[PDB]
Amino acid sequence: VHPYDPISDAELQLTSQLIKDATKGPERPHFIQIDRLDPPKKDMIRYLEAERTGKPLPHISRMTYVYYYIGLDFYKALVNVSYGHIITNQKQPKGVIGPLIAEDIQEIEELATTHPIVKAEIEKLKLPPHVRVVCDPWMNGTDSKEDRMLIQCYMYLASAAHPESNHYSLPLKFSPVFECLTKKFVRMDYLPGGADETVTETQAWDEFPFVEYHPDLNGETIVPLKPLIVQQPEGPSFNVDGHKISWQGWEFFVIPTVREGFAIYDIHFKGRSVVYRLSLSEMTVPYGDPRAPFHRKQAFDLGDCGFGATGNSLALGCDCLGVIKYMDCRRVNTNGDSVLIPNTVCLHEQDGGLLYKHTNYRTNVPVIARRREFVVQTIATVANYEYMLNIIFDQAGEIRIHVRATGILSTMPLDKDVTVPWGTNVGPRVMAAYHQHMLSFRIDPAVDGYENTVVFDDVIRMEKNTKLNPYNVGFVTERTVVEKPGYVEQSPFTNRSYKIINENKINPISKKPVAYKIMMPARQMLLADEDSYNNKRAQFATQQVWVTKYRDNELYAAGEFTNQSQTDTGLGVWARRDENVRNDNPVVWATLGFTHIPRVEDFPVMPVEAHEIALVPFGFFDKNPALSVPQST
Amino acid sequence: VHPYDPISDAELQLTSQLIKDATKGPERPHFIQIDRLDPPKKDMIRYLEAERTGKPLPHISRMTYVYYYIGLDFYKALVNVSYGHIITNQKQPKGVIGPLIAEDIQEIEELATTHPIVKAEIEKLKLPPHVRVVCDPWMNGTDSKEDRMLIQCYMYLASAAHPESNHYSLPLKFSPVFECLTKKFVRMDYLPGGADETVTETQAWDEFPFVEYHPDLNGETIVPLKPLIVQQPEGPSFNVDGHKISWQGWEFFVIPTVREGFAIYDIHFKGRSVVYRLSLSEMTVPYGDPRAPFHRKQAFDLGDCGFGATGNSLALGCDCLGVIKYMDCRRVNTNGDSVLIPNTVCLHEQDGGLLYKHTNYRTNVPVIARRREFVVQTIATVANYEYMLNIIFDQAGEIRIHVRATGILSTMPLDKDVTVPWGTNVGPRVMAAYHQHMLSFRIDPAVDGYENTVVFDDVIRMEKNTKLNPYNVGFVTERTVVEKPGYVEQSPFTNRSYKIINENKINPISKKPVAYKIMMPARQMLLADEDSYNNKRAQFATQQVWVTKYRDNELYAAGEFTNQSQTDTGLGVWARRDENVRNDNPVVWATLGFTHIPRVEDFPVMPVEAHEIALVPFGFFDKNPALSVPQST
Ligand SMILES: [Cu+2]
Ligand SMILES: [Cu+2]
Q1: A228/A216 same-domain check
Q2: In this structure, are B132 and B226 located in the same domain?
Q3: Whether residue A594 is found in the same domain as residue A460
Q4: Does residue B439 sit in the same domain as residue B565?
Q5: At A493, is the secondary structure helix, strand, or coil?
Q6: Nearest 5 degrees, angle CA A147-CA A148-CA A150?
Q7: CB proximity B290 to A under 8 Å
């Protein structure tokens, strides 16, 4: 029972039992989230040390956290499940609101088509019997001080005849708002369908131009394909022992977590340390339609919902090609039970093309190796969206963070003959507003050991017309050291390169500190004005790379409670501490910015758009580490 | 013979034979390059139309060009090979120098180690029995007005033991220069191995620290791997008819060419036109070591040598995984004969991960398709480098240009205890100078037809604090039209997106012209100072996107004759024509900039570094075109 292990049924239920026992009276605890805390890092580095060198393993208590409500009051407790005691069980200040949970959303979704005010609104549409109404409950977002947990219910039409009909293809022009925990009606909002902010009372609905994606409904003739099969007749080249993966020189743990999907720990390659913990830390999805209620669409999908909570089961359709191993996730329900989320993480090899090749032109004798890869993947369904998260390792020591966005666009109503400059029309009566997906990747590096420095290098021209450079072609690198928490500015035109180095371990060939470098393209950051709540709640989304000093339980880039937050309680605080991070424990938070101008081809379901960040050794080894890979032949 | 067909042996030899017959006297023609010209585009479009609709085919002659020398005089001729006559046969002006040819390089390489004057330098090294001298002859480059074709011979040491010993791991400090066609020794250059530009006479060589890549020599323990196999039990899903490929809705011609490796023509997807001609057009590799003779290392690998001339045989191999079809290239030798280069192009299908997924959270019914990809590939070996060029097509209408650079670094001598700020040390006595690979891709677009406009869209904030945008979150696109030949500036911070649109064909859903968009990251451009020959010779490498008006035989970014060129005779002239290119025949030249700071891991042979540009349908279709793809199931 390893300290990194994901939460068990017994730990999750013990945690809720203890809260139930501690809560007196008739309003019972309403559970929101429960998961296992990481072991304290200083302690766990000693545990792993002992585990690698066969010495006796130190005690590390298993700890969990719980978010729960008692009536309208929100609570966060810390529980020691090794010894069965609550350590802290604290009511949170006014305005701190927990994540959404499936059971509460289901309740509100039911209500949004059942409530008499909403039935009466629906009646004004004068729907024929072949058309039904569907609701997507959304988190409220923030445009004001608001301490109540509110649900903004987006309303749509679907075909009554088929349960997979594409409601996103026909948005309505009203949206009711409920208070989540009491189930009380709050107000009915009206949505503009025209070129500006004008709304009207609910009119009879004239036409039903659905744009269906499902094969039974889309009327598209299927163009056949011949099979392409992948086999591993002798089995896979990776081992899983508990949660410990071994493959081609790599050793690391892969742990499912309810908030991140999975996290990867204690990453070593060829026996050397590389990265202590790697995860998707947050993702904010701000929309750019300036009009109400749309301006409030800024989910924080990890913080408001959780990538593990929302993970698909990968085993029964075949998302992963080859010989696959799987892991499960668990979540609490509102009752405090452990709900299994089966097969959310898949692990498998695949072929990544060529790894290297060279032929001597004099002899035509080649050396060549294929780029075998090991993939860790999870896919989250977040209402309309699909996000596929992959971490891919290869035999040259590279770690590749690879995301594909797919699923369905979040859609707005559109009246006849209207266009808008902040959205693309994607169906005869449906518009998809422009948005961004701003992801933060948390990389706690341990490059060749636990004292690291973050740096960035620029590539710059040499002074022209000198004795040294008389032909005006020379160019050189210069390095800047990150001394304190903060961000680094992007600079694509000096080929700026972020690296984490170990100043204490010198490469004996290049004579510079060993390093890993980050590979990522320059990207547009937060488009919302600085004077906006979107800016205040998500500082990470405003710069490409952030550095903090490590702290236990500082994991989520916009802070622990994002749902309807008023301000950033993650990097917006942490990256401002005035402390030393040189030759220490800097933690890197890389922002992957994706501005999404939807196109028609993204509808009714969208082809994958891929985004990637790579961590690659840079003077970490004393020669290409892939000389150990068999020849391709 | 279809007009797009690659040259045949008969046509190549008819070309050289006509020139031999026309050349009188005892100085015989010395052949440098022969290939078949594209059919003139106007006629070819009519021809394709007739071929399509069963009308009589217009008459279009097969034509070739030939570069050759008579003594020291350089000539270019055009030949009609359908009827067998010379059209033009023209002595080129003083200073125009042809590409290198393998037979002439072999000759100068032999001479670099046998000429008495270089034998004398070698003797000064006092080499022991177990070491041998190796030469890589290089094109001269340009740092002065120079009319003679010169070869700079880079000199190295290798183990005498083994023909695959890595001579790049031990560079010498002298370099002989020879006049290519006369074989006259011109001069002996000396190379600095220290921190600055100081050089000495040739000294005895003290030690032999080779860094070996070959498995016989590298001493590496091989880490085993289990098999991973790809099968297509019913055969592939693509058909090849002549040079015409059909796969999953696409139809286009793949033609091998001596200069570009291959070119792809007449690209249609779902019956609609996309791109008329797609090709890697040039690649310049400028080095950033300011010192002589290094400052002159600036290859134009297509213009100076040719990607087809230099292509690997891929069937050997097997570089391409699965069920493969191959095509050949041919090149002339100095005698005018046709030399076959078997299997330089491989064509095959592969799995590219998931193409789309969506699960309705209510029912948990998924739609999912896998991303089947069709790959066209060639791999050229240019002296030390390998360049893997792929064009990948997918079922959603995307064309991905994907390049991988691998092979061996070009290396410079390095004395003990030296470092340099313009190069990385990659072995005990060998340094890899900084350099750039600047690629230009020529995309002659035919988006839904032959009248196109080039445009770029920017994503910008709405004005804050208005009635329309009261919460400061809104953002919109604005469009700029390219009206005249020239370049577009990069703007990654406004998410700038280059597109080619057809202003005559409006998407009936979005109400905007149909388009293809270019995906590519912002990159650093040419690092050589504006005041350098690198700059005057390669204007394309200074800006990321160029637009010209189409002309027949205007194919190569830096001009037809690059070797020891004084100036750019490509885009540096053509993108400065004052003419209109809106709703006409714009041609797009996309510069893929890769600044290469070598790492120790790139030596003795480098892991692939991948770079891409994608062409993606934007409002081209009225919905996702991949709804015709079968469920993955
Ligand atoms: Cu999106
Ligand atoms: Cu390079």
Answers
A1: no
A2: no
A3: yes
A4: yes
A5: helix
A6: 130
A7: yes
Q: Which of B101, B118, B142 is the last residue of a domain?
A: B101
Q: How far apart are CA B325 and CA B347, in angstroms?
A: 5
**Contact present, A398 and A614 (Cβ < 8 Å):** yes
Neighbours of ion ligand 2 (CB under 5 A): B 596
Chain B residues in contact with A367 (beta carbon < 8 A): 164, 213-215, 605
Domain range for B133 is: 107-220
- On whether both B249 and B190 belong to a single domain, the answer is no
The answer to whether A321 contacts B528, with C-beta atoms less than 8 Å apart, is: no
Q: What is the CATH number of the domain that holds B147?
A: 3.10.450.40
Tokens linked to A21: 């026992």
- Based on the fold, state whether residues A231 and A335 are members of the same structural domain: yes
| A177, A199, A220 - which closes a domain | A220
* CB-CB contact of A301 with A380 (8 Å): yes
Method: X-ray
Do B57 and B51 meet the contact criterion of CB atoms below 8 Å apart?
yes
* Broken C–N links (> 2.5 Å) in chain A, after residues: none
Examine the domain organization and report whether A342 and A304 are in the same domain: yes
The answer to whether A249 contacts chain B (CB < 8 Å) is: yes
State the virtual CA torsion across B48, B51, B54, B60 in degrees, nearest 10: 90
- Token pair of A474, please? 């020379």
Counting the structural domains of chain A, the total is 3
Rounded Cα distance between B281 and B264, Å, is: 12
Residue type, A619: G
Q: Which residues of A touch B228 (CB under 8 A)?
A: 230-232, 322, 349-351, 372
Sign of CA dihedral B479, B488, B391, A348: negative
* Residue reference for tokens 């004004």: A124
| A595 interaction partners in chain B (CB closer than 8 Å) | 459, 495
Nearest to A622 among B229, B235, B600 (CB): B600
Residue B404 and residue A353: Cβ atoms within 8 Å?
A: yes
Resolution at which this structure was determined, Å: 2.0
Per-residue burial over A357-377, b = 16 or more CB atoms within 10 Å of its CB, e = otherwise: bbbbeeeeebbbbbbbbbbbb
Chain A nearest-CA distance from B84, in A, is 35
DSSP string, B538-604: -GGGGSSEEEEE--TT---TT-S--TT-SS--SHHHHTT-----TTB-EEEEEEEEEEE---GGG-S
Residue B541 in contact with residue B577, Cβ under 8 Å? no
Distance CA B503, CA A270 (A): 56
Torsion over CA of B312, B314, B319 and B324, rounded to 10 degrees? 150
Q: Report the number of secondary-structure helices (H) and strands (E) in chain A.
A: 7, 32
Are A207 and A236 in contact, with CB atoms under 8 Å apart?
A: no
